């Protein structure tokens, strides 16, 4: 038997661990690498995991998503609820939009956040 792991170069790419066998050898790849000699950098973005026009970053053994405004989550799958912080004053009804909200103000109030009092005028 030749020990392929004790020759001039590591036959395993991308710093994989070479393990000798009788008649051959095997490679124990680092996370994110595949192939008999760990030749391939797995594309973690190949199944399109980043949603809603997010940018997928193909990294070593992982992906990361960069979300379009108004989206969040690991897959950018969550439409951020802009009504969460109760931005509408005076019990205004809050409507969630994309990276935005709308306030439906009660009688006598107006403005994006229902700030303006009109009760005194009438
Ligand atoms: C990575 O981050 C994303 C949030 C986007 O800004 C990406 O650019 C945008 O790509 C989408 C499709 O994925 C496209 O709809 C847009 O035209 C494009 N540019 C902008 C400025 O939105 C970015 O690569
Ligand atoms: Ca061998
Ligand atoms: Ca990768
Ligand atoms: Ca929203
Ligand atoms: Ca606004």
Curated annotation (Swiss-Prot):
<feature type="site" description="Interaction with DLL4">
    <location>
        <position position="58"/>
    </location>
</feature>
<comment type="function">
    <text>Functions as a receptor for membrane-bound ligands Jagged-1 (JAG1), Jagged-2 (JAG2) and Delta-1 (DLL1) to regulate cell-fate determination. Upon ligand activation through the released notch intracellular domain (NICD) it forms a transcriptional activator complex with RBPJ/RBPSUH and activates genes of the enhancer of split locus. Affects the implementation of differentiation, proliferation and apoptotic programs. Involved in angiogenesis; negatively regulates endothelial cell proliferation and migration and angiogenic sprouting.</text>
</comment>
<feature type="glycosylation site" description="O-linked (Fuc...) threonine">
    <location>
        <position position="55"/>
    </location>
</feature>
<feature type="glycosylation site" description="O-linked (Glc...) serine">
    <location>
        <position position="24"/>
    </location>
</feature>
<feature type="disulfide bond">
    <location>
        <begin position="5"/>
        <end position="18"/>
    </location>
</feature>
<feature type="binding site">
    <location>
        <position position="96"/>
    </location>
    <ligand>
        <name>Ca(2+) 3</name>
    </ligand>
</feature>
<feature type="domain" description="EGF-like 13; calcium-binding">
    <location>
        <begin position="79"/>
        <end position="115"/>
    </location>
</feature>
<feature type="disulfide bond">
    <location>
        <begin position="105"/>
        <end position="114"/>
    </location>
</feature>
<feature type="binding site">
    <location>
        <position position="80"/>
    </location>
    <ligand>
        <name>Ca(2+) 3</name>
    </ligand>
</feature>
<feature type="binding site">
    <location>
        <position position="41"/>
    </location>
    <ligand>
        <name>Ca(2+) 2</name>
    </ligand>
</feature>
<feature type="disulfide bond">
    <location>
        <begin position="12"/>
        <end position="27"/>
    </location>
</feature>
<feature type="region of interest" description="Interaction with DLL4">
    <location>
        <begin position="37"/>
        <end position="41"/>
    </location>
</feature>
<feature type="disulfide bond">
    <location>
        <begin position="45"/>
        <end position="56"/>
    </location>
</feature>
<protein>
    <recommendedName>
        <fullName>Neurogenic locus notch homolog protein 1</fullName>
    </recommendedName>
</protein>
<feature type="binding site">
    <location>
        <position position="59"/>
    </location>
    <ligand>
        <name>Ca(2+) 2</name>
    </ligand>
</feature>
<feature type="binding site">
    <location>
        <position position="58"/>
    </location>
    <ligand>
        <name>Ca(2+) 2</name>
    </ligand>
</feature>
<comment type="subunit">
    <text>Heterodimer of a C-terminal fragment N(TM) and an N-terminal fragment N(EC) which are probably linked by disulfide bonds. Interacts with DNER, DTX1, DTX2 and RBPJ/RBPSUH. Also interacts with MAML1, MAML2 and MAML3 which act as transcriptional coactivators for NOTCH1. The NOTCH1 intracellular domain interacts with SNW1; the interaction involves multimerized NOTCH1 NICD and is implicated in a formation of an intermediate preactivation complex which associates with DNA-bound CBF-1/RBPJ. The activated membrane-bound form interacts with AAK1 which promotes NOTCH1 stabilization.</text>
</comment>
<feature type="binding site">
    <location>
        <position position="24"/>
    </location>
    <ligand>
        <name>Ca(2+) 1</name>
    </ligand>
</feature>
<feature type="binding site">
    <location>
        <position position="21"/>
    </location>
    <ligand>
        <name>Ca(2+) 1</name>
    </ligand>
</feature>
<feature type="binding site">
    <location>
        <position position="82"/>
    </location>
    <ligand>
        <name>Ca(2+) 3</name>
    </ligand>
</feature>
<comment type="similarity">
    <text>Belongs to the NOTCH family.</text>
</comment>
<feature type="disulfide bond">
    <location>
        <begin position="83"/>
        <end position="94"/>
    </location>
</feature>
<feature type="disulfide bond">
    <location>
        <begin position="29"/>
        <end position="38"/>
    </location>
</feature>
<feature type="binding site">
    <location>
        <position position="44"/>
    </location>
    <ligand>
        <name>Ca(2+) 2</name>
    </ligand>
</feature>
<feature type="disulfide bond">
    <location>
        <begin position="67"/>
        <end position="76"/>
    </location>
</feature>
<feature type="binding site">
    <location>
        <position position="79"/>
    </location>
    <ligand>
        <name>Ca(2+) 3</name>
    </ligand>
</feature>
<feature type="binding site">
    <location>
        <position position="42"/>
    </location>
    <ligand>
        <name>Ca(2+) 2</name>
    </ligand>
</feature>
<feature type="binding site">
    <location>
        <position position="97"/>
    </location>
    <ligand>
        <name>Ca(2+) 3</name>
    </ligand>
</feature>
<feature type="domain" description="EGF-like 11; calcium-binding">
    <location>
        <begin position="1"/>
        <end position="39"/>
    </location>
</feature>
<feature type="domain" description="EGF-like 12; calcium-binding">
    <location>
        <begin position="41"/>
        <end position="77"/>
    </location>
</feature>
<feature type="disulfide bond">
    <location>
        <begin position="88"/>
        <end position="103"/>
    </location>
</feature>
<feature type="disulfide bond">
    <location>
        <begin position="50"/>
        <end position="65"/>
    </location>
</feature>
<feature type="glycosylation site" description="O-linked (Glc...) serine">
    <location>
        <position position="47"/>
    </location>
</feature>
<feature type="glycosylation site" description="O-linked (Glc...) serine">
    <location>
        <position position="85"/>
    </location>
</feature>
<feature type="region of interest" description="Interaction with DLL4">
    <location>
        <begin position="9"/>
        <end position="10"/>
    </location>
</feature>
């Amino acid at each position: 038997d030749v020990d392929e792991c004790s020759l001039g170069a590591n036959p395993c790419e991308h710093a994989g661990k070479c393990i000798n066998t009788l008649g051959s050898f095997e490679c124990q790849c680092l996370q994110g690498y595949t192939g008999p000699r760990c030749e391939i950098d797995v594309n973690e973005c190949v199944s399109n995991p980043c949603q809603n026009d997010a940018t997928c970053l193909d990294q070593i053994g992982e992906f990361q998503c960069i979300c379009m405004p108004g989206y969040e989550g690991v897959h950018c799958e969550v439409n951020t609820d802009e009504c969460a912080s109760s931005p509408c004053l005076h019990n205004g009804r809050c409507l969630d939009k994309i990276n935005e909200f709308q306030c439906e103000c009660p009688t006598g109030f107006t403005g994006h956040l229902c700030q303006v009092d009109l009760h005194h005028i009438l």
